[PDB]
C-alpha cells in the first residue's frame, strides 16, 4: 500500500498577551511521531514514537530549528491575515497548515500536498500538479499571485518530490516493525435485549491499524442501514483504533443479520453472525 508523511501546524493568536500558541505534529500514516508545543518548557521537537528515537542529536537540533522557524512564519501570517480580513487586534484567530507527501507501493513519490486554513476555512492550497494554487477567496488571491511571482510552488515541489519522500522512506524502514505491520481488527458481537421482543446487536472492531475500516450490516444478504448506528472511528490510546456498528432486531431473528468487516489487515472481509 501507499504510505504518507504529514505535518499539521496550528497557530492561535493571543490578543491579551504574548506570542501565538503553536502546536506542530508529525505523522507517518496514522502514527504520530513528533511534536512541538510552544507552551512546553523544552522548546524542542520531541519524539512520540520509538523508531524516531533512532535519530541522533543532529536530527533533533535540526527539527527544532525548523519548527521554531515555522512558528515564527505562522506568527507573521496571523498578522498579515488580520490585515487581509480587516479584523481588529482584539480577537483570537487561527492559522492551520498541513503538508506532506505520499509514496506508493512502488516506494516512489505518489503525491504531495501543502495547504492552509484561516479561522477554520480553506485559504490556499497547492494543487495536485504541484505547480499551481487554489485560492478560496479574494484575500487568498493576494497570496496566490505573490507565490506565483516568487515561484514558491517550484520550491515546494522540490521538497515534496525529493526530501519529503527520502525521509518517509527512511522512517518506514527504521520503524518497519510497526509502521509496515497491519493490525487486523479483533472482532466480536454483543447482544443487548431492549425488551422481551427486540435486541440490539453490536458488532465491534478493536485494536486495528491503520484507521481505515468499513463495518456494514446486512439482513438476509442485503445491506441494512435502517435501525442501524455507526460510531466514528476512534483512537484506543495505544496507537490502535476502534469502531462499532449496531442494529436493533426482533428477538429470535438474530440469525438473519450479518456484520461485515473490511480492513487491509484482513486477507478477506470477515462476516460475523449471532
Amino acid at each position: 500500500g501507499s504510505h504518507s508523511m504529514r505535518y499539521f501546524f496550528t497557530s492561535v493568536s493571543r490578543p491579551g498577551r504574548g506570542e501565538p500558541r503553536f502546536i506542530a505534529v508529525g505523522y507517518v500514516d496514522d502514527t504520530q511521531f513528533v511534536r512541538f508545543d510552544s507552551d512546553a518548557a523544552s522548546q524542542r521537537m520531541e519524539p512520540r514514537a520509538p523508531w524516531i528515537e533512532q535519530e541522533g542529536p543532529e536530527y533533533w537540533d535540526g527539527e527544532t530549528r525548523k519548527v521554531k522557524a515555522h512558528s515564527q512564519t505562522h506568527r507573521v501570517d496571523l498578522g498579515t491575515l488580520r490585515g487581509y480580513y480587516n479584523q481588529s487586534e482584539a480577537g483570537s484567530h487561527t492559522v492551520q497548515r498541513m503538508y506532506g507527501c505520499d509514496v506508493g507501493s512502488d516506494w516512489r513519490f505518489l503525491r504531495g500536498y501543502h495547504q492552509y486554513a484561516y479561522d477554520g476555512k480553506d485559504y490556499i492550497a497547492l494543487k495536485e500538479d504541484l505547480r499551481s494554487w487554489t485560492a478560496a477567496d479574494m484575500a487568498a488571491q493576494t497570496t496566490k499571485h505573490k507565490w506565483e511571482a516568487a515561484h514558491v510552488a517550484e520550491q515546494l515541489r522540490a521538497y515534496l518530490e525529493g526530501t519529503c519522500v527520502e525521509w518517509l522512506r527512511r522512517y518506514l524502514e527504521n520503524g518497519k516493525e510497526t509502521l509496515q505491520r497491519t493490525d487486523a481488527p479483533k472482532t466480536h458481537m454483543t447482544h443487548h435485549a431492549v425488551s422481551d421482543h427486540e435486541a440490539t446487536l453490536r458488532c465491534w472492531a478493536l485494536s486495528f491499524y491503520p484507521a481505515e475500516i468499513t463495518l456494514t450490516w446486512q439482513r438476509d444478504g442485503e445491506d441494512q442501514t435502517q435501525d442501524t448506528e455507526l460510531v466514528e472511528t476512534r483512537p484506543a490510546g495505544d496507537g490502535t483504533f476502534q469502531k462499532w456498528a449496531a442494529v436493533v432486531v426482533p428477538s429470535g431473528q438474530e440469525q438473519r443479520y450479518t456484520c461485515h468487516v473490511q480492513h487491509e489487515g484482513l486477507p478477506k472481509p470477515l462476516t460475523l453472525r449471532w
Binding site: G62, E63, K66, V67, H70, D77, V152, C164, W167
Partner: peptide
C-alpha cells in the same frame, strides 16, 4: 523531516 524554508509568507 520538516521543510527547510527563501521563506514564503501569506
Amino acid at each position: 523531516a520538516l521543510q527547510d524554508a527563501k521563506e514564503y509568507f501569506i
